[PDB]
Amino acid sequence: LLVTPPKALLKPLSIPNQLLLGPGPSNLPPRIMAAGGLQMIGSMSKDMYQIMDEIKEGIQYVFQTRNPLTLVISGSGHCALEAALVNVLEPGDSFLVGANGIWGQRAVDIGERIGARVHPMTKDPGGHYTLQEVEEGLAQHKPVLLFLTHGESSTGVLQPLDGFGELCHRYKCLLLVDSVAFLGGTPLYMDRQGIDILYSGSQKALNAPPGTSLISFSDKAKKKMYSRKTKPFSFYLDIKWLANFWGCDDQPRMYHHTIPVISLYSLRESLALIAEQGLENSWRQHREAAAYLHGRLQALGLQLFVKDPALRLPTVTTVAVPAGYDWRDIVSYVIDHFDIEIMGGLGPSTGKVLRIGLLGCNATRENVDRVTEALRAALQHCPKKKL
Amino acid sequence: KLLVTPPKALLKPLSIPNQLLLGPGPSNLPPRIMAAGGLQMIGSMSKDMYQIMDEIKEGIQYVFQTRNPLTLVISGSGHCALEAALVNVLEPGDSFLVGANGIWGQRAVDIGERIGARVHPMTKDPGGHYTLQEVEEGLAQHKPVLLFLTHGESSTGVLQPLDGFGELCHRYKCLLLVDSVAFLGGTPLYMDRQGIDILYSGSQKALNAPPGTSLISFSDKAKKKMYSRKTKPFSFYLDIKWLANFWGCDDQPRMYHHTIPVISLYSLRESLALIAEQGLENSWRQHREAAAYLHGRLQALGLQLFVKDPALRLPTVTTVAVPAGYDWRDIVSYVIDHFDIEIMGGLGPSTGKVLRIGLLGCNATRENVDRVTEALRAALQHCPKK
């Protein structure tokens, strides 16, 4: 006992109630909370495998793919992205990146750590890519893989994906897409759109807690991952091992690492919620709830950051920071006086935007009113600073 | 035309069985910890989420006995903690010595090779352990930058003494990375005093915690090495400079890096609370007592224990030699089908040579030892003979 039992740890755990209207994680409805409080089962029991299997069907549904190599990564969005990158890229492979926000920048950082010859196409916070711009990119750097971000949480932008699959394949290159927008925004049809890898952190698209990530790989991608002459740099994210345990190959399942049993309860149950509601109904709900916010922000005299309404990520909306205010003051006001969490910017967008989130069953008209009164009080009572 | 209709399986209620988990972990969760798991979300970067991280950290300092400011939760499982440690400390080309006496050693090796280390295993059959003399011959021959040792071998049921190994490794200018699931039951662990430079565990293996989070600690010698390398480590997700910052271990303010598993952390904290109330000494007693009573009850069933020396027996995970004439799969399956009790066979080098029975935290009761003993007794009676 160099260290006595902590004093802080002898008090009951107490957490505040907060309405979470940032980019995610969001609040959890009762059913999903309940799943989180259930008892443990064996991390390699037949029921645990039955659950994984249902989850997998869920990921197939929410993504629209027949890919047998579909599975949950035992970590967050950064971990899914990495798993994808660490497997598909061999040290020395050319890697093209759609760097129009932080998630692009992250892709780049990871790709450099793992020895890829990274080639960013950089665009200021606000922008998106055209089939033409990507094609010039594909010609110039002859890459093995393209990263694109579908839903940009940094900038509030919704990248159209139609065409990009068939373009990348025509240049003998795969297409990795980071989507949080598959539930609200535009429909996603992986197989049809020709996307070769598609990933998301459960907590960003579903009403799920953080710690787990949905991922899917096309056969073209498997081919590339499974035929490389070097071993990928991680064992934790090694896809051969992971595919086996998740039941995506012929053989019996081997111990690899321990999956987060409890979260998987919740993940499954969240994939259930959407499975009942249906994709089409969920698209409507978000697109309707967003619009009403867009309208209510403008009535507060707030300028939306993404000028073209067609390029607006419904799940995460970006407001331009009003002239004469410190964005920190506003963000802090909304949390202190209304227990509402919003967010400023992130990476390139830092300090240029506010970020407001409408995620799943929190994408209500009521919550848009609650956050609209909060901002309206904040615009009223915060100081005018020299920016 | 949707390619894939809404799954039929997913329109039915989630239903799970009740199972007494007496394998190596995860174990069953007491009510308090279940409750924590069912609470509402808070901001993944709110001041309260930071207050919770900080308490957790104190917990890890207590359960490990360290003043190390570079202590934190890895946002992944034990393989992920080990990797984070290895990916940061080892630079491609560094000599790395490994105490390969079970699977976890073998995993260390696999990881070290993927990240370009010149790995040097000291291999020993399932059953064995290392002596200060054996390690020293190793330290001389391969002049390594780091040594991996497994404290509690869940593969073989062995309890590696750690005394001496810190001061030895430092005398040869090399760090000491230890994988311990035995800090709660078995032998006391005093990281700082034992000279251990890195120490990790998957919450679910030592605490009554759910999987998905891992406790880790680094000495200042280790920070020095991780923070002064000329190359970037191969992972961003486990990059320690970034992680140390977000977990509040350095001077600066906290930056978005990745999203920590809020809900699991509730549970992790609450489990570190449970032990904080019980106290380390009381927990050591409880496990060591509960193990002994099992050892005695298995022998009365005519079962041979796998680790011959009683001093080298990991209390938290016990290995029985598979009785002559029996398929181990039959027995394992009998226990689950007729008593809702989960035990395990072997793993890696130990595969098909052992059964593995677990006594973890508040499941380390005398009642559960009876329940599993009666299961095995019935299994010896109803399973095929040979």
Author numbering:
A (entry chain A): 6 to 392
B (entry chain B): 5 to 390
Study authors write:
Human alanine:glyoxylate aminotransferase (AGT) is a Fold-type I pyridoxal 5′-phosphate (PLP)-dependent enzyme, which catalyses the conversion of L-alanine and glyoxylate to pyruvate and glycine in liver peroxisomes. The protein is a 86 kDa-homodimer and each subunit comprises a 21-residues long N-terminal extension that wraps over the surface of the neighboring subunit and is important for the attainment of the correct conformation of the holo-protein, a 260-residues large domain containing most of the active site and of the dimerization interface, and a 110-residues C-terminal domain containing regions involved in the recognition and binding to the Pex5p peroxisomal receptor. The AGT aminotransferase reaction follows a ping-pong bi–bi mechanism that relies on the formation of the external aldimine intermediate, in which the amino group of L-alanine replaces the ɛ-amino group of Lys209, the PLP-binding residue. Inherited mutations of the AGXT gene lead to the rare metabolic disorder Primary Hyperoxaluria Type I (PH1) (MIM #259900).5 In the absence of functional AGT, glyoxylate is converted to oxalate by cytosolic lactate dehydrogenase (LDH).
